């Protein structure tokens, strides 16, 4: 296999609508469902938004996760594996608050058989995974207003570190007139960035920790 110079999973219909997590630290759950959504499309041909709320409510203390106070994409995947399913967004809609677990196997929209973690800081391996496996869940350092106020172009933040805090989804990569980037789906609604997306600097020494903790699920 030869790696393409650019990849965009939106062009294979493997990426759902941008979501808005609202005033709730559930980025981890959106990142996890976004990665699984792509695998579901590849597996079944169906593009279905999966329930971030299912994860907030049900993948809890046993998985190190704390609902609107943060969690882990990797252990979200493990909950879906353990639970033998996750509900669709439409059946278990998102409320930007912690709720009682309400999973109902009757509305299961996807399963998960395994997940894979990529080596820390390896943007070459991240590129390979995005090209050959699908969108990849990642953490980034987003605790800078420059991130919240991003509008267009390739984002580069000299104040960034590799200590990541915010879960997002890499759905592609490319370059903008030679400025290489990662195409990142955020969960701050469509008014964020470029229609909900941010293009973050690529091959700039693991900029903002984008390749610090990548993972992706399979079905």
């Amino acid at each position: 296999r030869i790696l393409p110079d650019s990849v965009d999973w939106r062009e294979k219909g493997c990426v759902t609508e941008v979501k808005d997590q609202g005033s709730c630290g559930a980025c981890w759950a959106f990142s996890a469902v976004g990665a699984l959504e792509a695998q579901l499309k590849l597996k079944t041909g169906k593009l279905v938004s999966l329930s971030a709320q299912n994860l907030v409510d049900c993948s809890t203390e046993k998985y190190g996760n704390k609902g609107c106070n943060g969690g882990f994409m990797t252990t979200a995947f493990q909950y879906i594996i353990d639970n033998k399913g996750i509900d669709s967004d439409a059946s278990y809609p998102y409320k930007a608050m912690d709720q009682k677990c309400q999973y109902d196997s009757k509305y299961r929209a996807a399963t998960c058989s395994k997940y894979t973690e990529l080596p820390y800081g390896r943007e070459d391996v991240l590129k390979e995974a995005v090209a050959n496996k699908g969108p990849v869940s990642v953490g980034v350092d987003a605790r800078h207003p420059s991130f919240f106020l991003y509008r267009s172009g390739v984002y580069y933040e000299p104040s960034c570190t590799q200590n990541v805090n915010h879960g997002v989804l890499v759905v592609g990569y490319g370059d903008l007139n030679g400025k290489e980037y990662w195409l990142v789906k955020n969960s701050w609604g469509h008014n964020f960035g470029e229609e909900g997306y941010i293009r973050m600097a690529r091959n700039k020494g693991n900029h903002c920790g984008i390749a610090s903790f990548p993972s992706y699920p399979e079905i």
């Binding site: 981890w28 704390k66 943060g70 969690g71 994409m73 990797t74 805090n165 903790f213």
Partner: peptide, 8 residues
């Protein structure tokens, strides 16, 4: 080394 996705 992975931290929750704490300072939200």
């Amino acid at each position: 080394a992975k931290h929750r996705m704490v300072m939200w």
